[PDB]
Structures are given as structure tokens and as C-alpha cells.
Amino acid sequence: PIELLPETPSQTAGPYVHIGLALEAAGNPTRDQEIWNRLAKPDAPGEHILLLGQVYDGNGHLVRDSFLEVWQADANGEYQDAYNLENAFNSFGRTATTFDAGEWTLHTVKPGVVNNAAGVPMAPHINISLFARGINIHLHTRLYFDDEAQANAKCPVLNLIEQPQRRETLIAKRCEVDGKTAYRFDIRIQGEGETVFFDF
Amino acid sequence: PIELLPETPSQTAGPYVHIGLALEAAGNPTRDQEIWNRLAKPDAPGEHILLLGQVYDGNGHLVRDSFLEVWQADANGEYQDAYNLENAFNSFGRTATTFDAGEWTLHTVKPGVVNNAAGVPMAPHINISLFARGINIHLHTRLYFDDEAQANAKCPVLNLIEQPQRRETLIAKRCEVDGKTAYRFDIRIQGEGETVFFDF
Amino acid sequence: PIELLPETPSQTAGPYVHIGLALEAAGNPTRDQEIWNRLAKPDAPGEHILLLGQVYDGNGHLVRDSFLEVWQADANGEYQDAYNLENAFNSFGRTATTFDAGEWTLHTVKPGVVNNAAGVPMAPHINISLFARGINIHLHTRLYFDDEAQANAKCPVLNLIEQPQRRETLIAKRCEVDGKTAYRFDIRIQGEGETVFFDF
Amino acid sequence: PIELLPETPSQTAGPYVHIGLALEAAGNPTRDQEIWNRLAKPDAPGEHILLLGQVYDGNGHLVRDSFLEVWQADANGEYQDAYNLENAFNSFGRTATTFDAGEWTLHTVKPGVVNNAAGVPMAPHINISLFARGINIHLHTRLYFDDEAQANAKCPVLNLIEQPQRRETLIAKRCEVDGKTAYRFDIRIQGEGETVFFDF
Amino acid sequence: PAQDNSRFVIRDRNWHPKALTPDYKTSIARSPRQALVSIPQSISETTGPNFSHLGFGAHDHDLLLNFNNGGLPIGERIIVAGRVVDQYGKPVPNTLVEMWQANAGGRYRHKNDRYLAPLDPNFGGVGRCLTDSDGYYSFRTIKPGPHPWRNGPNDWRPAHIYFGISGPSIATKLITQLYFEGDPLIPMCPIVKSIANPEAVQQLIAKLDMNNANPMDCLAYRFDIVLRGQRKTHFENC
Amino acid sequence: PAQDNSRFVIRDRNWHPKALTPDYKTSIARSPRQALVSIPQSISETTGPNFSHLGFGAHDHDLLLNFNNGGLPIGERIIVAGRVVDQYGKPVPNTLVEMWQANAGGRYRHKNDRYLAPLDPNFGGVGRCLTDSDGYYSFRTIKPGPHPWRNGPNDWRPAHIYFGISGPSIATKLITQLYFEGDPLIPMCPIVKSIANPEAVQQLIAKLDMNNANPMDCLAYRFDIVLRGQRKTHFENC
Amino acid sequence: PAQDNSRFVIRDRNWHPKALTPDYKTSIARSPRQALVSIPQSISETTGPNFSHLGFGAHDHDLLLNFNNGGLPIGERIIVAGRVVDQYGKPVPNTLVEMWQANAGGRYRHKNDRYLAPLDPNFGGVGRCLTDSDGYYSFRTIKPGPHPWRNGPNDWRPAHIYFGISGPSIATKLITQLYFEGDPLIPMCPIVKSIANPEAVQQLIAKLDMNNANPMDCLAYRFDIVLRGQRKTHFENC
Ligand SMILES: O=C(O)Cc1ccc(O)c(O)c1
Ligand SMILES: O=C(O)Cc1ccc(O)c(O)c1
Ligand SMILES: O=C(O)Cc1ccc(O)c(O)c1
Ligand SMILES: [Cl-]
Ligand SMILES: [Cl-]
Ligand SMILES: [Fe+3]
Ligand SMILES: [Fe+3]
Ligand SMILES: [Fe+3]
Ligand SMILES: [Fe+3]
């Protein structure tokens, strides 16, 4: 059969991933421009939301050295690929878990609906890639919203998960943090309540 | 790189280990001198204690054919390698689980403090090696004592166990048995509450 | 390690190099445009000079079939790569030794100063490449000028020649020839007074 | 035939040999005890002599980074192998050429006569091993004395040199340096007047 | 905004390291036990950030100068250079390449690294660059030292530099580690050996590149990166 | 008392059998699922009992006479001898070697063995010896027979003798099984095959040793044992 | 005083590098053009200094501590250890072993080295030791970096450490260079290649020695040295 050049193989990002990709977290000075966890400036259109979460291993212990990358549509359901710290909104961001508490945060807007390749609307989602010590190739997941039940029920991606119980692992929980709209999205890498991870 | 002679590979001690190493348990006559579970004669200095425990497999069932070797300091925190049945104290002993109840016992004294190689004091501990049918290479563990909580908290070996919850698996529980101080140390080879095992 | 395509290997230019590169010298008719030994027309700016020399082998005998290529800056210390017979000055030229007397000549201007890559000024020089029967790969040298002694003393290229006595082999001697400034630059391929040859 | 383990092959001592073997010369602090160029304390028996010399390459240029080791009998013709800085005499020493002048010096006594393995007396000599950048395996020679003409003429080692002219290269020249007895021993590694080097 | 116009060749997850590779001990509890769920590519997966207008500092790619505290760092001066292409051999221009590493002694400038080898006051350990219009990148740095780590009782990472590459979509994004030609620690490392196929391991070994060295100055290593092949959509929804 | 002045070469746990070797069915539930925790060697690990003054009976090493109930045991009379050395090739003198086995028919003298082949009234199946000043040990015994067992539906252990060796510390202590040259059961046994590397398996196969036989009396097998290499500490705490 | 009681196996001067090796440019003018003159061994050649009573400082073999100016040197912590034997395999005890090297960046602490890589304020680059009664030596140091040099236009020495060994006589005295396992610069170096026989080059390559490493601390390399075989005189002058 036809064989292409093989892809460069993945390796773990390691425990010191912050040196390279989360400079403040390593305890190091930052450069003039850094790619970080504030996707939306205050005057970006859409519903402004705080996202937060913890990451658990198979023994139910916090993964305190997690590194996360996120990709989401703007409030109008459009992906903005021209990354610029001047923009009121960027579709891409990065975050990491605190070493003490194990919590990551993101400041963004709720993404609008995007259609799949067949033209079927997907429920509002944030694409997440998870990297860490002990993770040899990053894990892909999606964060959906518990206040989008009707859309979630119809999502052609959610519906590819064979067991209904597992779909629940991708639904973030709406709450309030200091009077502001928030969602919690915990990830369980392994075992009871294991988060669905995707291949594509 | 430099390659030495390879070590002889381990194999399971098998279900009839008792034939060779626990003669009575096998159902067989003993020789005049046997290495067994009484490390201390009544005259040995230090606090005389009974140790006992059960061993569980990954399904929570008793491992009724366990064989254990132990190595511990005397009450001064000194290892006594000159093994002699005439000695009031020996640092080494052997025990096995009953086929009926599955309980092993040891009669010894509480060991004194020993420093690690860097000069940092280790909490009082008994080194244990566990052999049985189904165990291809013996499992190493340590028995620490729950009446040493302050010392255990600073032990540089316990502190190498990354998760605090796992350190609890090595702490034997003090009780009284027929008016004598005793500690129970149960070992869980696999699963919920799995005992920490070491490599060195 | 990374291995590139190998370079085409050199071979001697042979005793009949003139057939291809010095047509007159071969005894043959010339084409309308030839690359030869007059780098400067009378109108070229700078100090007009005659260069001449003989080439000796290891037994002290004339190399009567030498072919030389030269490359030098103009009087401003700028290299002029746009070769054109219409130009008042060209940075490149060719010459050959007479089969009878064994002398080559060049008509040019004294080059200006050129800095090395580190910004340090090099003394005025002519780059020379020498080809002949018996020379398997051409020999690189530089012609410097004895009326530039103070500049020569500080040249970072001459100063890479570890022995001061060897630097003298690269210094052409100023004379007058038919009322015009001339310099003699003799080359000794081998033995006593062997000319410094470069690799770069 | 019988083949033994091969000897570890030699390599050049390099231009920075002084770092390791001539600490002051490198421009570095010395240790408490160093092996250096004073073989004899003032009160050692025998005729006290200064030795000095320069080392030349094949182009007649000074070898300014030479390192020399010497081995000689005491005045009574006995080799003293128990090296100790307390001793009034040591049979072994080290020296090196100055980077500016290219001169090495030694302070010693004139060695007494030593017999070869056949019982034949050898003329007074100092054994010398020469190391340097560009010397892949050290060169062995001997320094004999011009005021020992009768002994030199009869030396069974000198007489193994087939040409009389070459024997002269090993004879040091008696002089006076500040009213004190001295000998000059120059070494020519290559070419005219090339010093005899030994294999043994 | 970005659009769905391409498809990316499916990953070979037997070429990449698997999730559960127990000799690398931390992988045991940090690997999923359920199968990944395969989903079709949509605009969510086939688009990604372009960093053309991220503002890079003058020395962002030069670790000899980007942590200057009064001198040069100690250690083997090297250029690390290479090309980013996709599996069809097409160059990947204007893509973000990030790298980080320990110093010459294997010590990382991170609060969590307590290895006893000292920090270097003039070494930070982070670089970033955008590939040029032909897919090439280059960094200047010092060769990192091996690093012991608490895996087995005497485990040592080979000298390595971490690389992150964005590529044209979140589907192409990759983090990997570069190793150095000939390092005798490579065959022994449980992180290297998370990769089951020895030919895949070879893809992570940077080759000494004398052709790219600066004489009397710095050596050079070459590390080419291959991202997932990108093709146009064809015969979809018909 | 004992002192911490030595270090022992780290075990290769891919040379040894792994814990989880599912074809050996009892290993499935009796293998840890969490990684072992590496700890540095201290005096607790680098010391161990010396049995120089354990009192041995006259026949402790002689299984033809140590269960004498009126006659000799039935079966193939053999000496089993060899040397205990460490990985540096250094002999291990005055070390305890214990061995046990089934009889000629594969029946063990243990209350839990119900195999139908009979016990031998003059065979017990246990020996022990201290190595001499040069590391050598010697037993006289009967060659054990293969033993069926409830693993797969028709599994049979090759003839084997269990060995336990103390060595200089609890870090060197080992239990293993000796097998016999040419036994066609060896490649089929899931306990043998718990060892992944076939070269490691070869290290457990005792070789027929005619040079050590007693003519007209007993054959001999040779089984050398290699314990972890022991070295002095160097450059610690500085 | 010393006496003539032994003979030393003649050197193989096709095993050692020859004097004239023109790719190593400085050898051209510093090699004799006349043949060496062979002489028989006498007491002059078969004796040599013994350094048993040279006074060594506490840190003479420890380059991590023997140039202490307020910290540890930067770079890869290693032990360099090995045995000195003669060609008959006999150990060479109580012999002087001296070594020197550049720092982690290939910079030598010598007034004549102007390479632009910085000096390390806590690294000197010199060690010495006497072999023990069994012929073993050991040093602790940092792995030296490659060094460019003005030979060809882009020539770089592999990482190397200079060694000088006295041995029992001036006839055995040797200076050589140690190289490191796998270094891709080794095949390219005109100084290495002064040695014509590739098997001889292999003798100078120190092997990674995980067995001798200090976990969480320092790696180790092994470099054994073989000096000329020493035998008794026999049937001389008869
Ligand atoms: O977990 C640890 O001990 C730290 C560690 C290990 C391996 C690495 O490659 C690394 O960067 C850090
Ligand atoms: O499976 C059991 O419990 C019986 C058994 C099997 C294999 C052996 O080697 C052995 O001695 C005993
Ligand atoms: O001659 C030079 O440029 C210096 C130099 C070259 C090679 C070496 O190994 C060395 O230590 C020093
Ligand atoms: Cl191209
Ligand atoms: Cl030996
Ligand atoms: Fe790392
Ligand atoms: Fe058995
Ligand atoms: Fe021709
Ligand atoms: Fe060098």
C-alpha cells in the first residue's frame, strides 16, 4: 500500500513543561507577549464566562502539573485563527493547574454553534488538549455546557459516544464565582467517571 | 556501555515453599536449628512486641500460602547480622501465613532509629520481603508503627511516596493481645488500599 | 551525521590548460571576448600598477606552464562581480607564465581595504589561485604589498600564519618598470621559502 | 603467534599540557606538592649543574609549548625511584619551555656512570622524554656531556648510532651561567642536525 | 475566520507511544483505560491558531542571549535547526516552534527541580521561533546535560530538548523530545522506550550537522519534524 | 553490628520476570498494579543476616540420607553443585543456600499436594548448605519428576528444584528455580516463560556435569548462581 | 635504589599513532624524518619513579571540589574510573595517574586558550591519583565539551580528557586522550585518526558505566589502561 513519511512521534511534555509554555508557573520572568488563559478582553461580544477545573489520575489524586490548550469558536460560532494579543477575542488559549490547589482557569466567552462537515449543528463546545508528566501523547476532549441540554442531546459528536453515561463526563457544571457566571469541568484521566477522550 | 554478568532471574517460591523454609507448616519434622519468627528472647533489651497480619490478593481474598522474611534493627537502631539461635536478639526472621486463618505472627522488639545514607533519621521500621505462589519476584515493603506518627511524618523514605494516602498503607496499628503490645500489619498486594512496594 | 552531496573532485588543469583558458598562449586564435590580465583600463580610478612574478617548484626550477586566476577589490575596497569587458575595472582576471621566461604579468589598480567578517580591516591584497600540470587541486594564496608594511602588520589573515617568517612569503616587492609602479610576487610551491597557501 | 593485550595507544599531550603537568606555566595556582625541575637540593652530593635548552621544529622555529620529563642517576650512578620532595636528590623531574623565550631549565647534579645489561659502562647521561602539541608519541633521547669525551667515545649506547655525525647531536655544551656550571642541550626534532631519538 | 478546507491523515497510534507504558511509572495512573472515541474531522479539528502576528523579542530563539545576567552560559554551544514538513513532504511555513531544556548540567530552571547540579546564572532554557516561508527554523543554545529522575532506582534521561509545534490545525499540534546522535543513554530510557518501534525512536534523534556549524564558535545539530499529512477534501456528502 | 559501606547494582526488572504474567494464572491477582517506589540504598537495604554460626546437621545437604526411614530413596541419584558469585564475578563465601523439591515422581511432601503419584518413604525433599570460602556449594539428591498443576488444562512443570540464596544483604536475597539440561517441558511452561528474555531462561538451566559425577554411583549437574554486584560507596554526601 | 630486574614488551609503533600524520597539521614539522635508533633495555630504561610518597591533597582527584570559588561547576557530573594493567593482564598498583581537561563548554583554563566559550569560576580542570593496590583509580569531574581548533577550517575535537600514567618505568610512561562512548565527532577528528588502526581507536573510548553511577547525583564512565607487558629477564649474558 501507499506509505507516507511517518509523523514525528509524540513524547511526554514532562513536569517542567511550564519552563517553555507557562513561564510564570515555572517561577520565571515572562516575555513581552505570552499566549495565556484570557481568550476574551472585557468588551468582546458574547456571554463572558469563567471556566475552571481540576485533573485527576486513576487513583483519584490531583494532577498538579497539567498543561491545557483550548480552541473554541467566538460567540458567533466562528473560529478566529489570526492570533494577536490586540484582538478583543482569540479562539486559542493555554492554561495550567496550580501546584498547590491543582486548579486551572480560563476567561472566555461562550462559543456559538458550529456545523460539522455534514452540515449538522454541534452543541457549543471548547476543544481541549491535555498534556502532562506521564501522558505520552496528549489527550483530546471537549467541554460542553449543562445549560445547553437540548443542543447537547442532538450533537452529532456526543452521539458518537456509544454509552449515554459517558456523554455526561463532557458536560461542565454552571455555577457562580464572585457573582460571575462560571462552569466547572473536571477531567478524570482513568477509572471511575473517566472522561471521554477523542481520536481524530 | 559496561555490561556485567546478568543476575540469576527470580522465580516464584511456589505453594510448597514451606517444605524448604517453614518446615512445620509443611506438615514436616524440623531440624535441630530453624530460622523462624522469634527474633527476641525474653531477655532482649527494648520494648517486646507481637506483630501479626494477613495478606490479601486483588480480589480481596486471603493469601494463605504467604512466606515472609523480615529484617530490623535492635532497640539501639543497630543491625545485628551475626545470626545465632543463642542470641537474645536476631535482626532476621521468617514467618508464614496459616493455611486455615491466613495469619502470620512475629515476636520481636521495637526497632530503634536508623539514619539514611544522607544522615537523616528514618522512623522505626521493619523491612519485609513477601514470597508466594503467583509472586514471580518477591515484593519489598516496610512496616512502620502508628505510635510513631511524628517520626513517620518526617521519614525520608515515607516521604518518597508521592501521595500521602499511600503512606498510610505502611503504618501498622497498635493493639493489645493477651496483655502484650501488638501491631497489625495487613498487606494488600493489589487494588483498593494496595500496599506500597519498593525497589532498591 | 548529516552528509550532503559530495563535491565533484578536483583534477590537475594539465600542461595544455592554455587551450581552454589562455588561448593565445596555446598558439591559437582568440575569440572576440577573452578573460585576461588587464583588470583596469587607463580610466579606472586608483593607483595603476603592474604585477609580475615567476613560479618555482621544489627543486628551484621555473614552472613554465602555470595558470593563475586573481580576484581583488577596486580602489574603494569593493568587489566588483559584474564581469564586463566594457568596464573600466573588473575584480577578476587571468594570467599565465611564458613558456620561455616563465613570467606572468597583470595590469590592475591597487586594491583598497576590505574588513574581515568580524569587522577588522585586512591589509590590501590580491587573492590568487594557482593551477598547473602536477597540481591536483589549485593552490590559494594572497599577494600583499611591501609599501603597506604597517597595515600588513595588523592584518587578521596574515596574523593567522603562526610564524612571522612565513608571512614574508606573501609580501610582493615594489619596483619601477618603464616608469610605472610595479610589484614582483614570486611563488615557491615547495621547499625553502615555500609560499603560504590557504584553505577556506 | 602469541598476542598479548594491546597497549593503550599514545596521543599528543596537546598545547595545554601545562594545565595538568606544569601548573604555574598554564597561569594557574599550584598544589602543595608539585613534581618540577629541581632534582637536587643545595646539599646533595655531586657536581651541581644547571641544564638549559631550546627545542626546534623542522623549519628551525622554536617549539614554545614543549614539555620534558627527565630520569637520571645520582652522582654515585644509582637511580633513586622513591620520589619525595623531602629528598636531597630525586632521579626524576619535569620541565617546560617558556612561551616567550622557548627555553627550559633543570637544576640537578651530574649523573655517575651506570653499566648496561651486559656490564659495559655507559657514559654519564640524562634520559629525556619530549612531549608537545604535534608530537603523537613522545620522543626519547639522552643528554650526554661534552666534558666526558673519553667515556662518550666508549658508550655502548652512543656506539649503536651508525653515523658518528649523529652522535654529536646528543652531546650538551658546557658553559657558565652567572658563574655557575651549566650545559646547553638543544633538540632539533626534524631536518638539519636532527637529534637522535631512541626506541626501546 | 478559519474554514474547513482540509483533512489530516489519521495518526498511527502504534507509531506514537501508547498511553500505558508501565516502565515509565507515572504513565500507569495517567493513561485512560477506555478506548479513545474516533470522531470525523470537522472545522473544530481541522483549524487552529496562526501565530504570524505574535510579537517575538529579538533573542527569543537565542538561549545564549535571552537570559543574560552579565555573561554567557557555560556549556557546549550549538545551533539546533531543521525543517517542518507534513507527511506528503510539504513544508509548513509560518508555524510556531517552541523549545525548552535543562542547562549543561541537567538542571532545569523550575521551582520543582531540586537536582543538586547548579543552575547557570546566564541560562534560562526557553526558546521560540516561527518557521520561515520554506519551513525552516533555528535556535542557538547549549547542549543540555542528562538528568537523573525518580523512576527506577538509577534512571537517567539522555540529553534532551522539548519541542512543541503548532502546525496548521489543532489536529497537527505535537509535543515531542529531541535526543542527540550517539547518546548511550537513549537505548536505556523508559521515556524513549515508550515508543515501541525502534524506527520511530530514530526519528527523534538529531544528527550532528558539521555543514551548519560556525567554525571556532558553535557546533550544529539538525532536527526535522514531520506533521500529519494535509490533503484537500474530496467526494464528501455526495 | 552491620555497616553501610556497600552498594548493590540496581536490578534489571525486565531480566527478572515481571509481576503480571497472565499465562501463569495465579500471578493475575497477586501482582501489584501500582509502580514500585524506588528508594535509595541505606543500611536497612545493604545489610543482611550471615549464617556462619547456624548449626547444620550432618546430612542437611544430603537428601539421600536426611529422611532415612529404613532405605534409600528411589530415583536418579545426582549431585547438584555450583558456585555463587556476584555480577562482578566475585565469589560469595559463607552464604546460605537452601533447596527443596518433589520426589522422583513429582510428588511433594506437603500436606497440600494431592497429586496421585506416591510419596517415597525415604525422601523428604529439603536441603541446606553454606557456601565454602570460595563460593561453592554441593547437594546430593534425587532428580525430581515433572509435576502436573491446575493452570491450563494440561500444564506440567519441568523437573525443577527451588533454590533460596541469602547473599551479603537483603538486597541480594533471591528465590529461583533450577531446571535440567534438555528437558522438553521447559519451553512450554508458563512459569519458565514468566521470564521474557530467552537468555535469562538459559541462566536457570543446570548443565550435566560428568566431570563431577561419582562413577557407578551418581551423576552431577552444575548450577551457578549470580547475585547483584557489590561495590564500595564513592563520592557520597560531598 | 632501583634495579634492573625486568624487561618490557617492545612497543608496536603501528598500533600507536605514527609521528607524521599530516591531517593533524602541527605533526608535519614536529615529526622526526630519521628512523628511531633501537637500543637494548638497561637499568636506565627499565626503572622509573615511584610516587607513593608524593603528598596528595584531599581533593586532588575531585574536580568538582578542587577549584572551589563559592560553588559547584556547571556541567555533566561524572565519575571517571578504571584499572591500570600491563599487557599480561597484571595490575599496576601505586602508579601515578594524572588527567586534565577543558570545562563543560570546551574552554581550557590556560592563558593560551582564547576560545570564546566562557571559563567556569568553579572549574580548574586538573586531577591526580595513585592507583590502589589492585590497580584501580577514580576521578570525579564534569564531562568536557568539544573544542574547535585551527587545523582544518571547521575542525572540532570530540569531548576528551588527557591522561598521563607513569607505570613501573620510564619505558611504560604514556600520555593519551580519553574519548566518550558514542561521540559523533570521534570518526572525524584528525588527532584521533593519527591512530591508523580502528581497533586501537576503540581502546581510547570510555564506556558509559551505569553500574558505577551515584543515583540522583552523577553518571560514570570506565576507562581501563594497558601499559607495556613486564616480564623477568631470562637467559641473558649466557
Ligand atoms: O519526575 C522527575 O523526577 C523529574 C523529571 C524526570 C524526567 C524528565 O525528563 C524531567 O524533565 C523531569
Ligand atoms: O498450582 C499449584 O498450587 C500446585 C503447584 C504448581 C506448580 C509448582 O511448581 C508447584 O510446586 C505446585
Ligand atoms: O591548537 C589549538 O588551536 C588549540 C588546541 C587544539 C586541539 C586540542 O585538543 C587542544 O587542547 C587545544
Ligand atoms: Cl525544496
Ligand atoms: Cl582480579
Ligand atoms: Fe526532561
Ligand atoms: Fe514446584
Ligand atoms: Fe590531458
Ligand atoms: Fe585538547
B22 neighbors B96 (Cβ within 8 angstroms): yes
Phi–psi pair at F222, nearest 5 degrees: -115, 130
**Strand residue runs (E) in chain A:** 48-56, 67-72, 92-96, 103-109, 114-115, 121-122, 126-131, 139-145, 171-177, 180-184, 187-188, 198-199
Helical H segments across E20-163, by residue range: 43-46
User: CA C145 to CA C139: how far, in whole Å?
Assistant: 20
User: CA G26 to CA G4: how far, in whole Å?
Assistant: 37
The number of helices, as runs of H, and strands, as runs of E, in chain B is 4, 12
Contacts of E153 in chain B (CB under 8 A): 199-200
User: CA E53 to CA E96: how far, in whole Å?
Assistant: 11
Give distance in angstroms: CA of D19 to centre of ligand 9: 11
The three grid cell numbers given for residue F116, joined into one nine-digit string: 496421585
User: CA A75 to CA F145: how far, in whole Å?
Assistant: 78
Phi–psi pair at A165, nearest 5 degrees: -55, -40
The three grid cell numbers given for residue B98, joined into one nine-digit string: 496459616
Whether A150 has its CB under 8 Å from any CB of chain B: the answer is no
User: CA G97 to CA G82: how far, in whole Å?
Assistant: 11
Count of domains observed in chain A = 1
Helical H segments across chain F, by residue range: 43-46, 198-202
Contacts of E184 in chain B (CB under 8 A): 1
User: Smallest Cα–Cα separation from D69: which of D43, D91, D42, D41?
Assistant: D91
F194 neighbors F204 (Cβ within 8 angstroms): no
Q: Ligand 2 in contact with B133 (CB < 6 A)? A: yes
> What Å resolution does this PDB entry report?
1.8
The chain G residue lying nearest F40, using CA atoms, is: G215
Domain ranges of chain F: 1-238
Distance of CA A191 to the CA centre of its chain: 20
Interface subset of F 11-30, CB within 8 angstroms of B: 11-13, 15-19, 21, 24, 26-30
G211 vs F229, F235, F238: nearest CB: F229
Write out chain G in H/E/C secondary structure.
CCCCCEEECCCCCCCCCCCCCCCCHHHCCCCCCCCCEECCCCHHHHCCCECCCCCCCCCCCECCCCCCCCCCCCCCEEEEEEEEEECCCCECCCCEEEEEECCCCCCCCCCCCCCCCCCCCCCCCEEEEECCCCCEEEEEEECCCCEEECCCCCEEECCEEEEEECCCCCCCCEEEEEEECCCCCHHHCCCHHHCCCHHHHHCCEEEECHHHCECCCEEEEECCEEECCEEECCCCCC
Whether G214 has its CB under 8 Å from any CB of chain F: the answer is yes
User: CA D26 to CA D35: how far, in whole Å?
Assistant: 15
Distance of CA B30 to the CA centre of its chain: 23
The chain E residue lying nearest G212, using CA atoms, is: E154
Output the CA–CA distances (angstroms, integers) from residue B76 to B48, B147, B159, in the order listed: 13, 18, 23
Architecture of domain G1-238: Sandwich (2.60)
**Strand residue runs (E) in chain E:** 6-8, 37-38, 77-86, 96-101, 126-130, 136-142, 147-149, 155-157, 160-165, 174-180, 205-208, 219-222, 225-227, 230-232
E237 neighbors A118 (Cβ within 8 angstroms): yes
CATH number, residue B44? 2.60.130.10
Rg (CA), chain C: 17
Phi–psi pair at D170, nearest 5 degrees: -100, 5
Residue with cell 494577536: A84
Task: Give the method of determination.
Answer: X-ray
In the chain, the amino acid numbered B198 is F
Contacts of A135 in chain E (CB under 8 A): 19, 27, 30-31
Q: What DSSP element (H or E) covers B68?
A: strand B67-72
The chain B residue lying nearest F151, using CA atoms, is: B134
Which residue has the CA at smallest separation from atom 10 of ligand 1? A14
E90 neighbors G90 (Cβ within 8 angstroms): no
Q: What DSSP element (H or E) covers C167?
A: helix C164-167
User: Smallest Cα–Cα separation from E11: which of E47, E31, E44, E38?
Assistant: E38
Residues 6+ apart with CB under 8 A from C48: C40, C42, C107, C108, C109, C180, C181
User: Smallest Cα–Cα separation from B136: which of G146, D186, D153, F190?
Assistant: F190
| DSSP result, F100-133 | EE--TTS--SSTT---SSPP-TT---EEEEE--T
List the single best residue of C163, C168, C188, C190 to mutate versus D (max D Cβ within 10 A). Answer: C163
Phi–psi pair at F5, nearest 5 degrees: -125, 10
A28 neighbors E63 (Cβ within 8 angstroms): no
Rg (CA), chain D: 17
Whether A180 has its CB under 8 Å from any CB of chain B: the answer is no
Q: Ligand 2 in contact with F157 (CB < 6 A)? A: yes
Output the CA–CA distances (angstroms, integers) from residue A32 to A37, B98, E122, F41, in the order listed: 15, 69, 19, 47
Domain of D18 in residue numbering reads as 1-200
Look at chain C and count its residues.
Answer: 200
User: Which residues partner with C95 through β-bridges?
Assistant: C68
Give distance in angstroms: CA of E234 to centre of ligand 8: 61
**Cα dihedral across residues G151, G152, G156, G161: positive or negative:** negative
Dihedral angle of Cα A21, A25, A28, A32, to the nearest 10 degrees: 60
The number of helices, as runs of H, and strands, as runs of E, in chain F is 2, 14
Closest ligand to F163 CA?
7
